[PDB]
Amino acid sequence: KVLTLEGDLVLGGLFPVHQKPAEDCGPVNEHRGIQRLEAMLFALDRINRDPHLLPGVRLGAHILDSCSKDTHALEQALDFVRASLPTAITGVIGGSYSDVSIQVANLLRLFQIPQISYASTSAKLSDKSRYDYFARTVPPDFFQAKAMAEILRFFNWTYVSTVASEGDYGETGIEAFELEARARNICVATSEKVGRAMSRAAFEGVVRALLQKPSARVAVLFTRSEDARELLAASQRLNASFTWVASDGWGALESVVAGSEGAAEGAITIELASYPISDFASYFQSLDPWNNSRNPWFREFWEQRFRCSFRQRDCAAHSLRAVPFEQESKIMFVVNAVYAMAHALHNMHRALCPNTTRLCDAMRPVNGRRLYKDFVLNVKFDAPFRPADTHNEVRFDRFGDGIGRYNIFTYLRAGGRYRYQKVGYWAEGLTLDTSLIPWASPSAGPLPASRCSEPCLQNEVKSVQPGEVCCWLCIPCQPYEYRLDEFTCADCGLGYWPNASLT
Ligand SMILES: N[C@]1(C(=O)O)[C@@H]2[C@@H](C(=O)O)[C@@H]2[C@H](O)[C@H]1CSc1ccc(F)c(F)c1
Ligand SMILES: *[C@@H]1O[C@H](CO)[C@@H](O)[C@H](O)[C@H]1NC(C)=O
């Protein structure tokens, strides 16, 4: 099964239609697969009826299933390229998973095929020596580490402990954080990692490790949802008071804060900022297995979601209408990637084919290099189906990374039941309404400020510790010594004595 829609230019598409033994393909991914695949189809449908976006050129599709596996994505992604090894794939919209996009980016570069991922967030994909044909509507997770460092440097939380989940996400994220911390003069009290299958009592060890240096109340979490939950419970179980500053791993999930509400309180969490797209909800909820023949996996998905069968007769009776619709996090990015391609091709067409709306000879075939370098990257448009309020834009930096805009959430105790409130955002600079954070807003006691050392006295000079540069002991100058610097005393002589003001 492969999805093929006839068009003048054809877009390839990659979605993890199935989850990952001899089986590359398991259950239907009803949200990251079916919902996002249907969103690309939805976008094409609209582009194809839009008179300002390629009126003459009809966009086709050749959609493939990655099966949430790089190797299965590559076998499939061969379809895209054999069209040059007689209509070709003009550009690929896809890779949900980063490993999936890296695999497909390594193949498409050899055929100058532009590619826009709508979910691959690996910092690795920003390397244009490797991925020169790759852009993404979603920004790398290394941007949320920059924002985290900006939060601590604002609250002046200089001595902080850091926790990272074992993987590409945890390791690369925390590394970018430490780098942004060092340039903002923030010291890592204790670096910590959290492996895959760590036991209930194992995660409790990590809490005692962070408490070994108890002067740092701020814990910077760059963990996966699974770890951020198990660590929060091992913090509550041992009853540990921590000022969490977490990544979108934790995000604004009611799932992460389970039973450990009081322990999670005051936590600052970052979460990639999206909105539900208009019209897709009713597009999707109106899909039925009889009329949606074009999507080969729709009948497969139907039987899954409603737990019915074609032979069992009671299958058509259901509708995606009866079940309340929850629009997948990255739907917005899918549709922006499809429009970023539709626009790039449109602008290229406006430049190469000025005497016709028809696809001219200068674009038969499309030079993918000219398409990626001169049109995909230079795209700048008002995001399609954006909320009526917003003036949300679609553009890419030099490396094709999405323009990184995130939401900041604090954990609150509503008068009782515990919730998350958006306190600020990170556009290209941190912004946050401090009156919306409870441990700041009423000036109810001093800030939770985490520092290893408090400042030295008048008669004291701060002697720094050979290790960490943010730590010092308060050593006093001899009575025959005055305070020259703030880390150095000096002899007054032989007959001379220091001034009552350490001068
Ligand atoms: N951005 C992804 C990528 O593959 O780069 C892509 C997502 C998608 O298509 O929804 C898949 C993965 O979930 C994610 C891994 S990064 C990641 C971010 C937040 C976490 F909490 C976590 F644990 C890992
Ligand atoms: C952080 O430190 C600066 C410089 O001492 C100070 O002006 C600022 O008010 C501090 N911010 C907070 C919120 O503590």
From Swiss-Prot:
UniProt entry keywords in alphabetical sequence: Cell membrane, Cell projection, Disulfide bond, G-protein coupled receptor, Glycoprotein, Membrane, Receptor, Signal, Synapse, Transducer, Transmembrane, Transmembrane helix
Its membrane topology: Multi-pass membrane protein
Gene Ontology cellular-component terms listed: astrocyte projection; axon; dendrite; glutamatergic synapse; plasma membrane; postsynaptic membrane; presynaptic membrane
Keyword Cell membrane: yes
UniProt: L-glutamate binding residues: R32, R36, S98, A119, T121, D248, K330
Tissue-specificity statement: Detected in brain cortex (at protein level). Widely expressed in different regions of the adult brain as well as in fetal brain.
Molecular function terms from GO: calcium channel regulator activity; G protein-coupled receptor activity; glutamate receptor activity; group II metabotropic glutamate receptor activity; scaffold protein binding
Main localization, broad class: membrane
GO biological process: behavioral response to nicotine; cellular response to stress; chemical synaptic transmission; G protein-coupled glutamate receptor signaling pathway; gene expression; glutamate secretion; intracellular glutamate homeostasis; long-term synaptic depression
Top-level taxon in the UniProt lineage: Eukaryota
Glycan attachment residues as annotated in the record: N156, N239, N291, N355, N499
Disulfide bonds: C25-C67, C187-C470, C308-C315, C353-C360, C452-C471, C456-C474, C477-C489
Extracellular-side segments: 1-503
Cellular localization per UniProt: Cell membrane; Synapse; Cell projection, Dendrite
Subunit description: Forms heterodimers with GRM3 or GRM4. Interacts with TAMALIN. Interacts with HTR2A. (Microbial infection) Interacts with H5N6 virus protein HA.
Protein function: Dimeric G protein-coupled receptor which is activated by the excitatory neurotransmitter L-glutamate. Plays critical roles in modulating synaptic transmission and neuronal excitability. Upon activation by glutamate, inhibits presynaptic calcium channels, reducing further glutamate release and dampening excitatory signaling. Mechanistically, ligand binding causes a conformation change that triggers signaling via guanine nucleotide-binding proteins (G proteins) and modulates the activity of down-stream effectors, such as adenylate cyclase. (Microbial infection) Plays an important role in influenza virus internalization.
Similarity section: Belongs to the G-protein coupled receptor 3 family.
Protein's name in the database: Metabotropic glutamate receptor 2
Natural source organism: Homo sapiens (Human)
Residue range from the parent sequence: 24 to 551 of 872
